[PDB]
Amino acid sequence: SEWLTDFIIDALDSGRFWGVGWLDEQKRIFTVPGRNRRERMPEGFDDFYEAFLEERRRHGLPEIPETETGLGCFGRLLRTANRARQERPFTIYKGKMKLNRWIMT
């Protein structure tokens, strides 16, 4: 699961994904969108979790069950691979939008 570290870092530094940025580049603290408080995506940006699922196909991973979403899977894989973790606060807001806050390991 090296590709996951890579995918996250490339996504963050590209600035391309709605809700996906650093809060502390030195401490490696970053955000992904929350399931919950959603804002419509601007013109310039791409869907982070969509891209995540695509990347997962690229590494020959099985399609996620119909009971699952890219967001769930992303969190889970970050955890089982111990590649980032969460502390309170688990979330932060940008306007209306809930962001899930993470600390890379």
99 and 37 Cβ atoms separated by less than 8 Å: no
Closest CA to 30 of 42, 17, 43: 17
Q: What is the CATH number of the domain that holds 84?
A: 1.10.10.10
Residue 23 structure tokens = 């809060």
Beta strands in the chain (DSSP E): 22-24, 29-33, 84-85, 91-94, 97-104
What distance in Å separates the CA atoms of residue 46 and residue 24, rounded to the nearest whole number? Answer: 22
Domain limits for position 23: 1-105
Q: What is the DSSP letter of 45?
A: -
103 and 86 Cβ atoms separated by less than 8 Å: yes
CA angle 11, 45, 10 (to 5 degrees): 10
What distance in Å separates the CA atoms of residue 65 and residue 40, rounded to the nearest whole number? Answer: 26
2 and 10 Cβ atoms separated by less than 8 Å: no
Residue 77 host element (H or E): helix 70-80
Query: What's the sign of the alpha-carbon dihedral 21, 67, 62, 105?
Result: positive
What distance in Å separates the CA atoms of residue 35 and residue 43, rounded to the nearest whole number? Answer: 20
In this structure, what are the phi and psi dihedrals at residue 11, rounded to the nearest 5 degrees? Answer: -60, -45
What distance in Å separates the CA atoms of residue 64 and residue 12, rounded to the nearest whole number? Answer: 24
3-class DSSP state for residue 52? Answer: helix
Give the resolution in Å.
Answer: 2.5
99 to each of 48, 63, 66, how far by Cα in Å? 12, 25, 24
How many helices (H) and strands (E) are present in the chain, helices listed first? 3, 5
Number of domains observed in the structure of the chain: 1
74 and 45 Cβ atoms separated by less than 8 Å: no
